[PDB]
């Protein structure tokens, strides 16, 4: 289809240090993938979103809670696949 895979689905970040990376760059295809698209499902506000239309995330300023992003890839010709990630952020 366009098959996507996220880095783990499940991460464990220890407080106070909130700076992680979700690596959706191991997502495969039989051709090139035109773009990688990040979104967000859960989580509170006040985060510095950096480059949602790219491959490797640079996540900062994470409130301990439950974040849930989602990677979506687009083949040529267009085909989507949404695989999500969970951010179990604990003190």
């Amino acid at each position: 289809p366009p098959i996507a895979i996220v880095s783990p689905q499940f991460q464990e970040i220890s407080l106070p240090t909130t700076s992680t990376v979700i690596d959706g760059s191991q997502s495969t295809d039989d051709d090139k993938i035109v773009q990688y698209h990040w979104e967000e499902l859960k989580g509170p506000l006040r985060e510095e979103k950096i480059s949602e239309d790219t491959a490797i995330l640079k996540l900062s300023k994470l409130v301990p809670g439950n974040y849930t992003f989602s990677l979506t890839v687009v083949d040529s010709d267009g085909a989507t696949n949404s695989t999500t990630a969970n951010l179990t952020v604990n003190k």
Partner: protein, 518 residues
């Protein structure tokens, strides 16, 4: 001149002359039939690999000889005899011979393989001595001559990769038909010989500098050049900014005007061999050093020649900055720490930087009364004028040469895996069983052939490289550090066979044991 006559003898000498050493090695090979004689293309669209792991290429039935590791020529005693008293070595000429060809043919009649000796079948051999082909050698693959001489090895399969727009094929993607080269048909009585002479490649520096680069001064006399020692006079109350210069130094050695610079740097990641002092992420590929080439990322691995760690930090290693040779009992997927051999690279700490360390700090802003002199941190550094460095060490396992790619420009063409960067490397010797078909039908058919006789070859192969040594000219007083065997009551002798005949190289042996002053 067969059939009842050997077409060559077994030569496996290693002779040590004055300024040159001739290391002959002869192995027994076995060439199967690859692809069932087809130029099948290979790409990534069948498996469906990642965006940086797409490829496109072809996979011939030819097979190549790759005598491109150092233990294909040097026994561990000859390597010890070399690296202990030599400040350098380079090859002069090689001499390749391929004899005693036996073309067997196997019949799996009713589940029972009956290997039958065939006498009229041939074997095609050509050496690509004009470099029209992709040069797969020097990519550090398997399928070499084996380390231990009493091992039958199996010849690799010659595939090659070309340009791709992912898993597609751009109109620059070249296809190489290898029967469109003049090969040499070899029966069971003939032999393939050719000779080759290397370029005037520089000597591999098989020494370690006994002086640092920032310690190249007389420790007694002080210099005549001054510098700024102090931008704030201590009058016991507050700031004054009187700009105090003073001469030096016999003792303040870190601030003197040096004359040269350490080499280029490109930081890897500091990773502990002890698992408790590593981050709990993965890592690699998240915090690795990698480069964009045509929009696809690739780890540097092992990068530029840099030292592995600081003084007494043996637990740390650069994430991809070291040669990691596998032992036996090491699979090709997710092996633990014990079954590999991380080559510690610490003899080049004098000239070269540390791959897990910054290469200094430049300044950012302009200092004034208003703004403090903020400095930035340098991580990657291209070559400035006045940099000296020393290339990566070679190993008994590691590769001998590589091909300098035929580009319009290249800067210091030493291969990053170590070795001799050659413009015109030793040519690829490609070998292939001539396809002998099975019975054709009585009426003529247009379709090519869906049935051949299953066969394979065997035979011997001699490679004889003459090296040129650089005898040391030292006036060191105290003894050198030389590669010695562990003198102890041991369970098994190192670099030898086992209870059931498995040649196990226990450790990677470098070549930098001697000391030349810088």
């Amino acid at each position: 001149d067969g059939v009842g006559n050997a077409s060559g003898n077994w030569h496996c000498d290693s002779t040590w002359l004055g300024d040159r050493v001739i290391t002959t090695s002869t192995r027994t090979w076995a060439l199967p039939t690859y692809n069932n004689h087809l130029y099948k293309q290979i790409s990534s669209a069948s498996t469906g690999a990642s965006n940086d792991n797409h490829y496109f290429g072809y996979s011939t039935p030819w097979g190549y000889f790759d005598f491109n590791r150092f233990h294909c020529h040097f026994s561990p005693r000859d390597w010890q005899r070399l690296i202990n008293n030599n400040w350098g070595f380079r090859p002069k000429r090689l001499n390749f011979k391929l004899f005693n060809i036996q073309v067997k043919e196997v019949t799996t009649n009713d589940g029972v393989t009956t290997i039958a000796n065939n006498l009229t079948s041939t074997v095609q051999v050509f050496s690509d001595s004009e470099y029209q082909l992709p040069y797969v050698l020097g990519s550090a693959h398997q399928g070499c001559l084996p380390p231990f001489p009493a091992d039958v090895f199996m010849i690799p399969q010659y595939g090659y990769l070309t340009l791709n727009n992912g898993s597609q094929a751009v109109g620059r993607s070249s296809f190489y038909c290898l029967e469109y080269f003049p090969s040499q048909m070899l029966r069971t009585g003939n032999n393939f010989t050719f000779s080759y002479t290397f370029e005037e490649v520089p000597f591999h520096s098989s020494y370690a500098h006994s002086q640092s680069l920032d310690r190249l001064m007389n420790p007694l006399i002080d210099q005549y050049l001054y510098y700024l020692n102090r931008t704030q006079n201590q009058s016991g109350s507050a700031q004054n900014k009187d700009l105090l210069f003073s001469r030096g130094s016999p003792a303040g050695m870190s601030v003197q005007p040096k004359n040269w610079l350490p080499g280029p740097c490109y930081r890897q990641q500091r990773v502990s061999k002890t698992k408790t002092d590593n981050n709990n992420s993965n890592f690699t590929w998240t915090g690795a050093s990698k480069y964009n080439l045509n929009g696809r990322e690739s780890i540097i691995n092992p990068g530029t020649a840099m030292a592995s760690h600081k003084d007494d930090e043996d637990k740390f290693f650069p994430m991809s900055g070291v040669m990691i040779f596998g032992k036996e009992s090491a699979g090709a997927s997710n092996t633990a720490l014990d079954n590999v051999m991380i080559t510690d690279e610490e003899e080049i700490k004098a000239t070269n930087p540390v791959a897990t360390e910054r290469f200094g700090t430049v300044a950012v802003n302009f200092q004034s009364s208003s703004t403090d002199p903020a400095t930035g941190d340098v991580h990657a550094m291209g070559a400035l004028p006045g940099m000296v460095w020393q290339d990566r060490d070679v190993y008994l396992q590691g590769p001998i040469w590589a091909k300098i790619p035929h580009t319009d420009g290249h800067f210091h063409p030493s291969p990053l895996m170590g070795g001799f960067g050659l413009k015109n490397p030793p040519p690829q010797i490609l070998i292939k069983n001539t396809p002998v078909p099975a019975n054709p039908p009585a009426e003529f058919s247009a379709t090519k052939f869906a049935s051949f006789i299953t066969q394979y070859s065997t035979g011997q192969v001699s490679v004889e490289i003459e090296w040129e040594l650089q005898k040391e000219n030292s006036k060191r007083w105290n003894p050198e550090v030389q590669y010695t065997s562990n003198y102890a009551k041991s369970a098994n002798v190192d670099f030898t066979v086992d209870n059931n005949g498995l040649y196990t190289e226990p450790r990677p042996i470098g070549t930098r044991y001697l000391t030349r002053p810088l």
